[PDB]
Amino acid sequence: MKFTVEREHLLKPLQQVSGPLGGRPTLPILGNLLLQVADGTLSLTGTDLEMEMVARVALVQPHEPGATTVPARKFFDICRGLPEGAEIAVQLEGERMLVRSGRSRFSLSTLPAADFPNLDDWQSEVEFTLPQATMKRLIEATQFSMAHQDVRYYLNGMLFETEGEELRTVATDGHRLAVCSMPIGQSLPSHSVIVPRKGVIELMRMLDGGDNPLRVQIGSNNIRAHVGDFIFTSKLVDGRFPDYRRVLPKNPDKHLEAGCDLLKQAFARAAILSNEKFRGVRLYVSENQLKITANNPEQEEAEEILDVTYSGAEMEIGFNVSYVLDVLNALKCENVRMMLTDSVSSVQIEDAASQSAAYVVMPMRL
Amino acid sequence: MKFTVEREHLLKPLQQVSGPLGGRPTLPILGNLLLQVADGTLSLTGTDLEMEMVARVALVQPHEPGATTVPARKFFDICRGLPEGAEIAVQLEGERMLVRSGRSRFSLSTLPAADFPNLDDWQSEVEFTLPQATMKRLIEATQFSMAHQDVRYYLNGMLFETEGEELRTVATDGHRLAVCSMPIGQSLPSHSVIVPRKGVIELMRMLDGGDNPLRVQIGSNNIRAHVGDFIFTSKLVDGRFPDYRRVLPKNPDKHLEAGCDLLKQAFARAAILSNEKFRGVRLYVSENQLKITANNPEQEEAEEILDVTYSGAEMEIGFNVSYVLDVLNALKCENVRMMLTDSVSSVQIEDAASQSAAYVVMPMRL
DNA sequence: CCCATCGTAT
DNA sequence: TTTTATACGATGGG
Numbered sequence: 001m002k003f004t005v006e007r008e009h010l011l012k013p014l015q016q017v018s019g020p021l022g023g024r025p026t027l028p029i030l031g032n033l034l035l036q037v038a039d040g041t042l043s044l045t046g047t048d049l050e051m052e053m054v055a056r057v058a059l060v061q062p063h064e065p066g067a068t069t070v071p072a073r074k075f076f077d078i079c080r081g082l083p084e085g086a087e088i089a090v091q092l093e094g095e096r097m098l099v100r101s102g103r104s105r106f107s108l109s110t111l112p113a114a115d116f117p118n119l120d121d122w123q124s125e126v127e128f129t130l131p132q133a134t135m136k137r138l139i140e141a142t143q144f145s146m147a148h149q150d151v152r153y154y155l156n157g158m159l160f161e162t163e164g165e166e167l168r169t170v171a172t173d174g175h176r177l178a179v180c181s182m183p184i185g186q187s188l189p190s191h192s193v194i195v196p197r198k199g200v201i202e203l204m205r206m207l208d209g210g211d212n213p214l215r216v217q218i219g220s221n222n223i224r225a226h227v228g229d230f231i232f233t234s235k236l237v238d239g240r241f242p243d244y245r246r247v248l249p250k251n252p253d254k255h256l257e258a259g260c261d262l263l264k265q266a267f268a269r270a271a272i273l274s275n276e277k278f279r280g281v282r283l284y285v286s287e288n289q290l291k292i293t294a295n296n297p298e299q300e301e302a303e304e305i306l307d308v309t310y311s312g313a314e315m316e317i318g319f320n321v322s323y324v325l326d327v328l329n330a331l332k333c334e335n336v337r338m339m340l341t342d343s344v345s346s347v348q349i350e351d352a353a354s355q356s357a358a359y360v361v362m363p364m365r366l
Numbered sequence: 367m368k369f370t371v372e373r374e375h376l377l378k379p380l381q382q383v384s385g386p387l388g389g390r391p392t393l394p395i396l397g398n399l400l401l402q403v404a405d406g407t408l409s410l411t412g413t414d415l416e417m418e419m420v421a422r423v424a425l426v427q428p429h430e431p432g433a434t435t436v437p438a439r440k441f442f443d444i445c446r447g448l449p450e451g452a453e454i455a456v457q458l459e460g461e462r463m464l465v466r467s468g469r470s471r472f473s474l475s476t477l478p479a480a481d482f483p484n485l486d487d488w489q490s491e492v493e494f495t496l497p498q499a500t501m502k503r504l505i506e507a508t509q510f511s512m513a514h515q516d517v518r519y520y521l522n523g524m525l526f527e528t529e530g531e532e533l534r535t536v537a538t539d540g541h542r543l544a545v546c547s548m549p550i551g552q553s554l555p556s557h558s559v560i561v562p563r564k565g566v567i568e569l570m571r572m573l574d575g576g577d578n579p580l581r582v583q584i585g586s587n588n589i590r591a592h593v594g595d596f597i598f599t600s601k602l603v604d605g606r607f608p609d610y611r612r613v614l615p616k617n618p619d620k621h622l623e624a625g626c627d628l629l630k631q632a633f634a635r636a637a638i639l640s641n642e643k644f645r646g647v648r649l650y651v652s653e654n655q656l657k658i659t660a661n662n663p664e665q666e667e668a669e670e671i672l673d674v675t676y677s678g679a680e681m682e683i684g685f686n687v688s689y690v691l692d693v694l695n696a697l698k699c700e701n702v703r704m705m706l707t708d709s710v711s712s713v714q715i716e717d718a719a720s721q722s723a724a725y726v727v728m729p730m731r732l
Numbered sequence: 733c734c735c736a737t738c739g740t741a742t
Numbered sequence: 743t744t745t746t747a748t749a750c751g752a753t754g755g756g
Contacts, residue, residue, distance in 0.1 A: 011747035023736095074638055074666070080747070081635040096666070103671040104635055109664040133744090209744045269447040269470060272440055298475045300440070300462075305469035389753070515733055522733095563733095735756085742748070 001037045001066025003059050004089040007082055007101075013055030014076045016230055017046035019202050020053055021072055032069040034116045035090075035097075039065075046072060049117050051199050051234035053206070067113035068092050075099070078106050119233060124217035124224070126162060126191050130184040132207045132227065135214050138169045139204050141180035141357045144326045146197050147173035154239030158200045160223070162188035170244045176323045178330070179244040180357040194241050195223055199234035206232050247360050249346050252339030254315070256285055257352050258308035260336045263290075264328040266304035270294040271321040273302035280364045281321040285340070286314045294321070317343045318364035324349075327359040367403050367432025367458040369425055373448055373467075379421035380442045382596055383412035385571050386419055386564070387438055393483075398435035400482045401456075401463075405431075412438060413483050417565050417600035419572075433479035436463050444472050485599060490583035490590070492528060492557050496550045498573045498580050498593065504535040505570050507723045508544035510692045511537040512563055520605030523562045526589070528554040536610045542689045544696070545610040546723035559584055560607055565600035572598050613726055618705035618714045620678030622651060626702045629656075630694040632670035636660045637687040639668035646730045647687040651706065652680045660687070683709050684730035690715075693725040 017033055025031045025048075034045040042057045079088060082101050089100045092110070099106040139158070147155035150173060159170040165188065168181040195203070206227055207214070215226040224233040267281065274281050274294040284291040288310055294302040317340065327349050328336065335352040343366070349359040383399060391397035393415070400411040408423040444465055445454060452467045458476070465472040505524070513521035516539060525536040531554070534547040561569070572593050573580070581592040590599045636647050640660035650657035654677075658670040683706065693715050694702065701718035715725040 008747065013747095015747055071664075071666075076747090077638050078635060078668075081631065081638065083631070104632070105667075105669040106635075106639065107667040108639075109666050136744095208746080265447065265449070266470070269444060269472075272443045272447065273472065273474075300475050301471075301473045302444075303471040390755085733756105736754100738751095738753080741750090742746100 001035065001068055001092045002062075002064035002090065003037055003042050004061045004063070004087060005042065005057065005059065007079055007084065007086040007088055009057060010079050010088060011076075013044050013057055013229075014072075014079060016206065017044045017053045017055050018072050018076060019205055020046045020048040020051055020198075022048060022198075029069060029111045029115055030117070031071060031073070032111055032116070033072040033075065034067065034069050034113055036067040036113065037063055037065045045116070047117050047119070048198070050196060051202060051232065052117075052119055053202060054231040054233075056229045056231075066092060068097055069111045069113055069116050070097050070108045074108060119222075119235075122219045122222050124219050126189055126218045127216065128162070128167070128184060128186050128188060129213045129215050130167060130182075132210060132212065132214050134167070134182045134184065135216075135225075136204070136207050136209070138167065138180050138182055139200060141330060142169045142171040142178035143200060143204070144330060145171035145173060145176055145178035145359075146200070148197075150174070154194060154237060154241055157194040157196045157237045157241075159192060159194055159241040160218075161190075161192040162218075163190050164188070170241065172242055172244075172247070175320065176326075176359070176361040177242070177244060177247050178327075178357070178359050182356065191218060192241065193218055193223060194237035194239060195234060196237050199223070202232055202234070206230055244358070247346075248358060249339065249341050249348050249360065252341050252345075252348050254285070254310075254312040254340040256290065256308055256310040256312075256338040256340070257335055258290065258306065258338075260328055260331055260333050262306055263308075263336060264325065266292055266306055267321055267325050267328065270302040270304050271325065273300045274321050278364070279320045279322050280318050281324070282316060282318050282366075284314070284316045285310055285312070287311065315340065315343060316366075317347070318366055319347070319361060320364060323361045327361065330359075331357075367401065367434060368428075368430040368456065369403055369408055370427040370429075370453055370455040371408065371423065371425065373445055373450070373452045373454055375423060376445055376454060377442075379410055379423050379595075380438075380445060382572065383410045383419040383421050384438050384442055385412065385568055386414040386417050387412050388414075395435060395477045395481055395483065397437060397439070398477050398482070399438040399441060400433065400435050400479055402433040402479070403429050403431050411482070413485075414564070415483050416562055417568060417598065418483075418485060419568065420597045420599075422595040422597075432458055434458050434463055434476045435479055435482050436474045436476050440474060441465070485588065485601070488585045488588045490585050492555060492584040493582065494528070494533070494550060494552055494554055495579045495581050496533065498576070498578065500533070500548045500550060501569060501580055501591075502573050504533065504546050504548055505566055507546035507696060508535045508537040509566060509570075510696060511539060511542055511544035511725070512566070513539035514563070516540070518605070520560050520603050520607055523560045523603045524566045525558060525560050525607040526584075527559075528557045530554075536607065538608060538610075538613070541686070542692075542725065542727045543608075543610060543613050544693075544723070544725050548722065557584065558607065559589060560603040560605060561589055561600060562603050565589070568598055568600070572596055610724075613712075614724060615705065615707050615712050615714050615726065618707045618711075620651070620676070620681070620706040622656065622674050622676040622678075622704045622706065623701055623718050624656065624672060624674035624704075626694055626697055626699050628672060629674075629702060630691065632658055632672055633687055633691055633694065636668045636670050637691065639666045640687055644730070645686050645688050646684050647690070648682060648684050650680070650682050651676055651678070653677065678706070681706065681709060683713070684732070685713070685727060686730055689727045693727065696725075697723075
């Protein structure tokens with residue numbers, strides 16, 4: 001195997017395929033990147049057995065086919081540390097890979113490419129294209145609601161559902177839920193899959209915010225996304241995800257609307273004096289007014305009064321303020337709408353000017 | 367106690383005094399700030415028992431004398447969380463301090479001002495004024511060479527020494543050492559003291575990049591620094607700091623000069639493949655040339671060659687590349703000078719065009 | 733004091 | 743002012 005490439009055409013791919021790696025590998029080979037030269041292209045792959053990131057680089061200079069694997073971190077840092085515009089010549093020399101540039105020489109240890117994990121081929125059942133911004137919007141709007149290493153394995157991920165001409169993402173940890181839908185102008189078959197949290201993270205990281213479309217393929221047990229010269233593939237979580245349609249409150253007749261930022265700043269300040277663990281805050285809604293109070297074990301107390309739009313019956317309800325703040329932070333709109341039912345029922349939060357995304361959060365006991 | 371101040375006139379001071387605190391105090395009250403209203407001045411103090419930071423804020427609005435202590439982080443977060451230009455009214459009421467602004471209200475638990483740690487009165491024995499830039503240079507030039515948690519307490523700090531018309535700083539961990547001297551335009555008595563590691567950090571933090579003079583007072587067991595409306599005081603570390611004069615190599619006859627960045631980048635790359643434990647690299651000096659090599663347990667190997675200015679005899683010496691990089695990273699100059707003696711001797715390093723600072727690194731011999 | 737993650741400055 | 747071939751300060755915890 002042999003190839004010579006410009007430092008900059010290499011740093012981009014290397015950085016991307018290193019994503020799957022997460023330190024302290026269970027297998028030493030999972031700490032390496034697979035390098036493959038064939039038909040004028042250099043392919044680099046990074047994986048953690050659950051997913052893989054593949055980058056392809058065009059070889060415009062003389063090269064020789066072949067493959068090997070080398071320490072990802074070490075190789076990336078070496079390339080990163082050479083001077084801008086540096087020419088990096090690489091060649092396999094037995095049990096080690098030689099890297100040369102200017103007057104710098106580096107010999108790295110290798111592991112047989114043949115031993116590199118290889119996700120078994122599979123077949124896509126649903127395919128579609130969409131702008132990176134749409135995919136970016138969908139994940140950002142719900143990612144924060146995904147569960148974190150929760151015993152209910154089916155919650156440690158994000159649901160990606162196709163329905164009609166829409167792609168929707170759903171995320172929940174049992175206490176709060178987020179859902180967002182975006183039309184992708186294509187009649188799609190109805191399909192639902194759970195993408196593991198690490199996969200959603202990688203997916204988001206492969207979006208360079210450009211105009212290049214995203215090509216997505218979904219199989220019975222896998223999802224693949226192609227953007228530019230990168231191909232990401234992840235296994236799916238085998239389980240049954242909650243139905244957002246049954247999570248949304250049934251009868252939230254009490255509607256409250258208020259400026260998003262003023263509402264967020266009030267909760268942010270009140271949260272300072274809320275229980276550090278439970279983080280509960282009390283809301284008292286009355287005619288065009290909202291009273292937010294917070295108390296902690298120290299018996300400290302925060303109170304915020306703000307003008308809002310509300311014409312329903314007065315009521316008091318408690319909420320974990322972090323859950324509320326996460327929603328307001330994600331919205332990033334002008335005004336938000338809170339839909340309540342009673343003190344023992346969840347609340348639904350949405351952008352006042354958009355029902356594309358919905359947020360549900362369970363109340364806390366007084 | 368009562369006062370009303372604009373948010374912006376309070377934010378800066380709060381951050382300054384919340385410096386020694388950090389997170390998780392060892393003693394509860396250390397997590398509180400002392401607030402004192404006397405005359406037309408509000409004083410705010412933060413401490414960690416070893417040092418204290420005091421800020422003075424002129425009170426132009428009506429006030430009432432008094433003092434108390436309140437959770438520093440909570441108070442700062444409340445103030446910071448209020449809208450720009452907010453007026454912050456504060457009043458003490460029993461065991462709680464009431465904070466109000468617009469329609470936001472906060473009640474903080476207090477601890478008696480009489481309980482607040484107060485360094486005993488002490489006498490200054492040496493005093494001088496110096497430009498803030500001189501203190502910044504002295505600290506930045508030597509800070510990295512201080513020990514961190516050495517059993518020899520005095521190495522976990524920085525020696526500040528007055529001699530003739532110079533102020534000098536020395537820092538060493540026993541493996542490497544840094545010394546820097548600056549003229550301060552005033553004849554002073556010969557004096558030496560050791561400032562604790564955390565104190566050095568704070569001296570640094572209190573510099574504002576302006577022309578405000580830095581007034582220093584040194585006593586048998588304390589050092590005080592005054593800049594603008596801020597006064598920092600720290601206890602000193604007892605001990606006999608090592609004499610840098612005796613640490614500088616005696617006969618470092620072989621002198622090599624090279625570009626600081628080129629040398630730094632080569633060392634940085636070579637470092638990637640050095641023992642992650644001992645981080646040793648080997649240097650080979652020959653006529654106008656430097657060869658840096660490194661290998662690790664994985665049998666990987668790196669080699670850098672650089673054109674340098676050198677006429678002495680050839681020699682091979684080992685070093686902890688981290689120590690070498692720390693110096694080069696500090697010496698942000700055009701060219702560096704490395705003064706060698708032999709394979710079992712230390713190397714002296716300095717800016718090729720300046721002797722104001724010198725660095726010594728123990729060799730790594732086989 | 734050391735370590736990992738981190739919103740986000742750069 | 744959307745972004746990485748990025749970096750150091752704030753941060754929750756041992």
